[PDB]
Ligand binder design. Structure first.
Ligand code: ZN
Ligand code: ZN
Lengths: 49, 1069, 54, 89, 49, 98, 18
């Protein structure tokens, strides 16, 4: 090998590896198998904050 | 300033008493005995212009490549001159080539530490083409083929910079041998010269043989050896200059000749030096000059008028909005003026004249004590007056104002005696400042004191009769009441009307004085006519040399008017009953005592201070820079002054681009009104005094130095550097200036602003290294984009008028020589290790002995050849199935197999190096596939093989193809056969890489010590070079420069000697 | 010569001379502020007009 | 430019063709996944920021500003701009 | 601060830079997987309704 | 088939002058500097400044206007290229509004 | 050392005399 990459191949690969992750599954408020709502009991606006 | 001393005392030797402290002890013994920018602005470095050269001037040496076979059977060893050990002007070798080596035979006293040294082509010279813009290049054997143009331009600039030298006259002799009857040979210093006596004079060697060198020497002309002309002026003295024939180079001869022409244009003489010094001294200092046949000194100091203006503009650009850059300059001028000014303070004048003031002890205000406590007469409070005087010369950049600390807090009131005295101090101090708003600030200073005592109408609500007096520092803030005096009603408010009338009537009037000389120094001042120097106050010279007290001048009139106004204010009707009768009498007595105080300062300012300033001005580290002075004309008050260094986007005219690409230059300096008032009120001369003798004694020590001459040389170097920078930038990038380009065939990248800045940095570094300069050079012209650079300056009035100065660019011998070197390189590219055209990588096997650098026309094809495929942007490659041959897309969308003649751009091959290598090298090595990779320019490295043995060159080409990289490529390897003196056998030699155009211009001679060449490439001594010796009808002073070098020319060698100025010019002490 | 120079071609008062105006202003006319050179020009022009009429 | 060589065949099966309608439905589901919170969108913006920083050829340095100023308004603007901070997230 | 400063490398070549930076990104792609998952998402939505 | 931007875009070529008022960002910076210069020039709106700081304000504003930055060039000549390259490759395709 | 004039007091530091 006589060539080294200008952008790089380690840094770009790590950045793409970090960007490849999916979006978090926001499961709060949805029913569970038995019907109870998975979640916490905080008020909605306060909990969003 | 009170420094008491405690502890660690000892004994005294004069008297054996023991003292308390060491400082008290030394006092007793005495009784017994009784940043980077500021430094560059003050002490600028001095370039080394004149440098001599004892050795012969040349840059192209002939180096052997492979040794000759002087031990051989066909020819006996007695035939060759090498056996007899006869020194020859040319090496005896089978192959000899010429290379570039600056000052390979020179001998200098000061060395430009920037040299171009090249190895013979058999070695690797790639390291000379990768210095500039190769940071991401991995291997040490390759360079990026996109910065070849920049590398070559830097190399040529270094070549010129090294070749800037002046030839030197060393000494001669006579030839006692029968060779060259009566010729006068030249000798040069060093450990030995026997080799030089043979190298310098090719036509002096004997001619016994029938070798190529011997034949050339016999064909030469006998009567062109050594000196043939001279200029002898005095018996027993060095000849001024001589003209000799010796081994030289036309290019370097022309470069040094143009350098000598520039310096000769610069040359001056002691008569002009004496005249200039006398004119600058205005007769106070008399210098002498010899009147006799001189020895033709060389003093290159006179410069044209454009470089002075350009250097002044560059200095103003360096002096931005930073006070600390120029404040030390003002302090230096102040301490220099202190050495000359005869005005000495006895600060006890005020105390003595105020002691005898009648007042009652029972009173509780004591105006005499009040004024003494307000003034606080000190001794060090005069550097402020020095700086106030010094700001007149630099009005254009520095605006000396009065610090707010001098103004009373809240403005006080007229009921307050101390505030009245503060008004007195401010009123006397203000006229001496260069601030164009002092006339309005004085009126506002008085108005703010009596708020509610009398009121006047004042424009807007924000700027009012109670607004701080120091906030009126701009022309737009001048009140209409102060403009039109009639608005102030003289019934309720007579005092303000009278003060406005006094300001409008008795304010000092501007004047001027002639300074310096333009004959040799030139006039660096701008926005004003040459040779003039403006002043705030009027200047009436005295016709007597024994000055005495007089009271008829502007400053005394101003003080009298202020005192009269205060007497009227005290003697008013609404203010009289507020004070006791005795206090009013004491105030009137003090005002009368101070009205007629006998101080010499106003007369000094009127009559002598302008003379001192005009004497100091010519020689100074920073030349004066002024703008017109206006007394009360608000319309002509300057509001801005700025400089430019670039155009906007497209317009290429500085007169059009100066408006919106300028940076304002200016900074305010704060003085102290108390010191200036004390200086005005206290001043005296020595008891006896004669101005002529005093100044003839004080000015003489100042006129023995060459700092101004060094400054002129620095200005020339700066102008040369900026012109060279803009020319070299225009070479690689498009710009507004008209310039021709010869190096377009060298591939180059698309230069950006960062690339241009890097090239500018490298050019600046090379110039500084060559001229031995450590301070900043052309640094101010690098903060922006160097692709579009221009120099201009302007200043704007209040009404809207704009006056601008756009200096013209003068010539540049450095840029001319650089362009000349590029033009010569256009034809001599081979001598610099660079080939033209492109290469062909088709396999060729034969037994013929043609050099690959000069291929036969049969083996070369181009774009116009019938039946050839040209490959461009699309290079899709399809494999083959079941024995089908793989095919690659053409430029016209046609699939073709791996066979025939192809053209590949080097960019394409770099971008697809790995994919192409695996697919193509198999067919190229064994097959009928040939590729013409087009480059335009490339370095080359030679390889010599014996033509009697098998020599396959596949390994070198394979290594080259494998090492081709998207970023870098290595040097092209060529396999060249060795020329043979006698008959030889023939062996096969596989060849892969051949050139396209002829590239054997670096070959000098083959088998130089042999009668003839039978096998291999050959060429005799080049007749086209030695034109002076081979052509009997060519005049001796003839050069054919743009095509060849000629390796032999008539060169002029000078013997001028450069002494310091004071050595030749003596002044009467 | 920043303010400008005025030449009187036809038999000057005492010989060939040039008049250089200064920064002194004329405030007799209320609405306008007139400097020295413009005042000289105005007075001379009005005198010549009166002479031409008479 | 890319290329994907292959040999002729019909047994190959590789389903990668869907409709813009299905793409839009999936996008709508992804948008509804947010539900007004920054915990699910912060990593996406952060790592796209990192990717853009690592790909972009632009190199940011306040040394240009420092050299241009070459040091009062100049000192005030330099202190306000803070050339010593090197975070451009 | 980022707007008032910024400079390219002196030896910048757009073709080389982008051809070197794109390759690691496209060598770590997942758009085919996302396309294969979107059809399942729509399938689930339709079956649910 | 498109992707909207809040800035204009031009074909990419790194040879254009850094000082170029065809570029809208550079033009915007120049006009802001000119507005500040006009605001400070007449010294009104600033009562209390005891010195004539206009000569320094105009100088520093001119320096900022004529600075050497190439970010306006980048944001309109290259940034859309990287954005369009990454956009199809993203786990969360862009959701955008006019 | 540095000494005040109105009242004879020697202050070691050069600045507190003011
Ligand atoms: Zn003693
Ligand atoms: Zn005290």
């Amino acid at each position: 090998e006589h060539y080294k990459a200008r952008p790089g191949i380690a840094s770009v690969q790590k950045a793409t590896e970090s960007a490849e992750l999916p979006m978090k599954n926001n499961d709060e408020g949805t029913p569970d198998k038995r019907g109870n709502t998975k979640g916490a009991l905080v008020n909605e606006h306060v909990e969003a904050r | 300033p009170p420094t008491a001393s405690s502890g660690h005392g000892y004994q005294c030797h004069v008297c054996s008493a023991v003292l308390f402290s060491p400082l008290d002890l030394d006092a007793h013994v005495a009784s017994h005995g009784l940043n980077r920018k500021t430094a560059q602005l003050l002490h600028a470095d001095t370039p080394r212009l004149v440098t001599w050269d004892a050795g012969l001037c040349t840059s192209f040496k002939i180096v052997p490549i492979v040794p000759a076979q002087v031990p051989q059977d066909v020819l006996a060893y007695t035939f060759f001159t090498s056996s007899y050990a006869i020194q020859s002007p040319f090496p005896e070798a089978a192959v000899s080539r010429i290379v570039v080596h600056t000052r390979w035979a020179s001998n200098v006293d000061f060395d430009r530490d920037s040299s171009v040294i090249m190895a013979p082509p058999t070695e690797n010279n790639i390291h000379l083409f990768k210095q500039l813009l190769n940071t991401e290049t991995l291997s040490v054997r390759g360079a990026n083929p996109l910065m070849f143009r920049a590398n070559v331009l830097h190399m040529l600039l270094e070549f010129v910079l090294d070749n800037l030298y002046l030839n030197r006259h060393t000494g001669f002799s006579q030839d006692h041998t029968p060779f060259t009857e009566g010729a006068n040979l030249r000798s040069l210093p060093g450990p030995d010269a026997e080799k030089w006596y043979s190298i310098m004079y090719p036509t002096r060697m004997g001619t016994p043989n029938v070798s190529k060198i011997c034949n050339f020497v016999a064909s030469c002309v006998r009567n062109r050896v050594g000196r043939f002309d001279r200029a002898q002026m005095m018996n027993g003295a060095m000849s001024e200059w001589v003209d000799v024939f010796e081994t030289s180079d036309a290019l370097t001869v022309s470069i040094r000749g143009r350098w000598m022409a520039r310096l000769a244009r610069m040359n001056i003489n002691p008569t002009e030096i004496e005249w200039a010094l006398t004119e600058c001294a205005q007769g106070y200092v008399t210098v002498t000059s010899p009147y006799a046949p001189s020895v033709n000194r060389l003093m290159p100091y006179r410069i044209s008028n454009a470089e002075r203006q350009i250097s002044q503009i560059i200095r103003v650009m360096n002096i931005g909005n930073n006070a600390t850059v120029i404040q030390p300059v003002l302090q230096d001028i102040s301490v220099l003026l202190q050495r000359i000014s005869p005005l000495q303070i006895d600060p006890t004048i005020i105390s003595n004249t105020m002691s005898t003031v009648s007042e009652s002890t029972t009173q509780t205000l004591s105006p005499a004590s009040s004024i003494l406590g307000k003034l606080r007469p000190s001794n060090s409070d005069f550097s402020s007056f020095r700086v106030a005087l010094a700001g007149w010369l630099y009005n254009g950049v520095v605006t000396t104002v009065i610090d707010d600390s001098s103004y009373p807090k809240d403005g006080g009131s007229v009921t307050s005696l101390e505030n009245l005295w503060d008004f007195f101090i401010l009123a006397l101090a203000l006229p001496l400042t260069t601030d164009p708003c002092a006339p309005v600030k004085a009126f506002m200073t008085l108005a703010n004191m009596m708020v509610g005592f009398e009121t006047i109408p004042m424009d807007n609500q924000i700027y009012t009769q109670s607004r701080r007096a120091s906030a009126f520092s701009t022309p737009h803030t001048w009140p209409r009441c102060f403009m039109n005096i009639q608005l102030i009603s003289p019934i309720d408010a007579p005092i303000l009307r009278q003060w406005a009338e006094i300001i409008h009537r008795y304010w000092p009037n501007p004047s001027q004085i002639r300074y310096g000389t333009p004959n040799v120094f030139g006039s660096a001042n701008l926005f004003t006519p040459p040779e003039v120097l403006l002043l705030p106050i009027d200047h009436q010279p005295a016709n007597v040399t024994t000055p005495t007290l007089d009271f008829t001048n502007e400053l005394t009139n101003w003080r009298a008017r202020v005192c009269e106004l205060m007497k009227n204010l005290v003697d008013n009707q609404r203010y009289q009953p507020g004070w006791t009768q005795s206090l009013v009498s004491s105030m009137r007595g003090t005002l009368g005592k101070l009205k007629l105080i006998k101080s010499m300062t106003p007369m000094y300012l009127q009559q002598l201070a302008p003379v001192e300033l005009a004497v100091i001005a010519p020689m100074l580290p920073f030349p004066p820079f002024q703008v017109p002075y206006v007394r009360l004309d608000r319309d002509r008050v300057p509001t801005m002054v700025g400089v430019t260094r670039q155009s906007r986007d497209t317009i290429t005219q500085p007169a059009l681009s100066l408006s919106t690409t300028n940076t304002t230059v200016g900074v305010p300096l704060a003085l102290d009104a108390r010191a200036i008032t004390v200086a005005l009120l206290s001043g005296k001369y020595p008891p006896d005094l004669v101005t002529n003798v005093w100044y003839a004694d004080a000015i003489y020590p100042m006129y023995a130095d060459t700092e101004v001459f060094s400054n002129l040389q620095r200005d020339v170097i700066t102008c040369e550097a900026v012109q060279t920078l803009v020319t070299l930038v225009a070479q690689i990038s498009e710009t507004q200036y008209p310039v021709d380009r010869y190096l377009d065939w060298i591939p180059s990248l698309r230069a950006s602003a960062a690339t241009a800045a890097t090239f500018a940095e490298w050019v600046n570094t090379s110039m500084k290294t060559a001229f031995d300069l450590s301070d900043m050079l052309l640094e101010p012209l690098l903060s922006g984009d160097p692709r579009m650079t221009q120099l201009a300056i302007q200043y704007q009035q209040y009404n809207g008028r704009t006056f601008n100065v756009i200096p013209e660019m003068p010539g540049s011998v450095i840029a001319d020589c650089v362009q000349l070197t590029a033009e010569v390189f256009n034809h001599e590219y081979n001598l610099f290790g660079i080939a033209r055209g492109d290469i062909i990588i088709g396999r060729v096997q034969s037994t013929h002995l043609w050099s690959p650098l000069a291929p036969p026309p049969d083996l070369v094809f181009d774009r116009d050849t019938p039946g050839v495929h040209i490959f461009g942007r699309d290079c899709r490659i399809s494999f083959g199935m079941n024995g089908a041959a793989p095919m690659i897309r053409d430029e016209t969308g046609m699939m073709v197999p791996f066979e025939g003649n192809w053209i590949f751009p080097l960019a394409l091959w770099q971008m697809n190096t790995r994919y192409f290598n695996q697919q193509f090298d198999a067919w190229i090595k064994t097959g009928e596939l040939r590729i013409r990779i087009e480059m335009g320019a490339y370095p080359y490295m030679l390889h010599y093989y014996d033509p009697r043995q098998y020599a396959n060159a596949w390994n070198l080409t394979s290594a080259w193809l494998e090492e081709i990289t998207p970023t870098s490529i290595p040097s092209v390897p060529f396999m060249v056969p060795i020329s043979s003196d006698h008959d030889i056998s023939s062996a096969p030699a596989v060849q892969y890489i051949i050139s396209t155009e002829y590239n054997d211009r670096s070959l000098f001679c083959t088998n130089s010590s042999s009668p003839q060449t039978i096998a291999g490439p050959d060429k005799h001594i080049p007749v086209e070079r030695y034109n002076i010796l081979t052509n009997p009808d060519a005049p001796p002073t003839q050069i054919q420069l743009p095509e060849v070098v000629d390796l032999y020319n008539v060169v002029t060698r000078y013997a001028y000697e450069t002494p310091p100025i004071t050595a030749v010019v003596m002044g009467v002490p | 010569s920043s303010a400008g120079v005025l030449v009187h071609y036809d038999k000057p008062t005492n010989g060939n001379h040039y008049i250089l105006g200064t920064l002194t202003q004329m405030v007799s006319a209320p609405p306008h502020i007139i400097n020295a050179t413009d005042a000289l020009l105005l007075e001379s022009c009005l005198e010549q007009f009166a002479a031409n009429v008479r």
